[PDB]
Symmetry: C3
Subunit: 154 residues, 3 copies
């Protein structure tokens, strides 16, 4: 059972890109923006875009395995003073595209954002074959981010 | 090795991943049983079984201490001109869970992504009873044109 | 062969959790920042236990020192006062970078029930493993009165 134990150890070992950008000043505009293209201009405070964020094709990529990928994006920042209705959205291309939206209104005063989801990657499936283009967009006004934490794990 | 066989089972994902393409599905402002709604459609890929029970119109789970991950991705629209709007999805359970994706005038897109998990216990409420999923559009009716639903455990 | 490695794999694939249900309660979530563990710990659970993931001495969520992700869910049945239009529930987790969850709604939505779910990619010997997380909850728009609460952390 030696080889099968090796395989199980691999199967139960988390693979991850956990990248933190601290003390930055990054504009997330109201026009759609490729998130990998935006981030790769910055120097991480810790972590690396590789292996989950491909800086050649500007996409999230996955391991070709029947193992689900968990994704989280935590953004510290602000919209302009007085911005009432506002949201942050993030779309992932795929066989069916997924659009995350975090909306708020005047009742909420914090502007910090937390988006989380998962992708049920199939071997030789769409994500494994093509990757995913991540398109971020701020709604209501432009957003200025000062800390960004992005995680993809599988 | 029985223990290695078991570990391979334990670490193998079980899933329903069902896609409905090119449809025009009304999600009304009144509560609607989601499994009942979907089973009137023909998947472009995947199968409702084993996680979506079309006899009792509910989500069902394996009787295992293994968490179920759920995602509903909808490409669709609220009517042109709709400002305040939301999509909600309730799961029955010992304590019912109500997911809400709300938005307002600031957001143009009407596409929806609801993701959550259920910490299934052996012999617990979900394993025993399953969960009725009740979907409802708020602010106006909604029309779904692509639906992707995933339950995995 | 490989007995210890198999033991370790069985441990790695065994979910550890706190799942606490508070049924038939009346809990005010005010408009000011409020420590969530402090708020819950005086309530007698209907089922489950706050320990080990919710530490009632330091009022923090705490984690096992393992390279294993923690999944978190908070399900709340309750209400804002009648007529409350714009409203949200906010939950912040301290961390190297704090995470701020918001569930907002407006006049279009009648239900006041709330579901917040997320995960934390715990690293062995990392920030959460060493410090835990202070969970701070706040109701926006008006005070919220919770009557059923289900809280889960698993790793
Ligand atoms: N199974 C799809 C992903 C489904 C999802 O969006 O989670 C793929 O491998 O591309
Ligand atoms: N432990 C509950 C589910 C808890 C949850 O909603 O995640 C059950 O087995 O029914
Ligand atoms: N890796 C971080 C947690 C990252 C997260 O917020 O998920 C820690 O161990 O504290």
């Amino acid at each position: 059972g030696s080889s099968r134990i090796d395989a199980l150890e691999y199967a139960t070992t988390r693979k991850k890109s956990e990248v933190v950008y601290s003390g930055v000043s990054v504009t997330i505009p109201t026009a759609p923006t490729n998130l990998v293209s935006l981030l790769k201009t910055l120097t991480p405070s810790s972590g690396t875009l590789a292996p989950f964020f491909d800086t050649v094709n500007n996409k999230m990529v996955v391991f070709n395995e029947n193992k689900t990928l968990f994704f989280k994006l935590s953004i510290v920042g602000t919209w302009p003073s007085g911005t009432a209705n506002r949201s942050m959205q993030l779309t992932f291309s795929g066989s069916v595209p997924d659009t995350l939206v975090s909306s708020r209104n005047s009742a909420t005063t914090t502007d910090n954002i937390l988006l989380a989801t998962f992708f049920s990657v199939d071997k030789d499936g769409f994500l494994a074959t093509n990757g995913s283009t991540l398109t971020i967009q701020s709604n209501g006004a432009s957003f200025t981010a000062t800390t960004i934490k992005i995680i993809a794990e599988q």
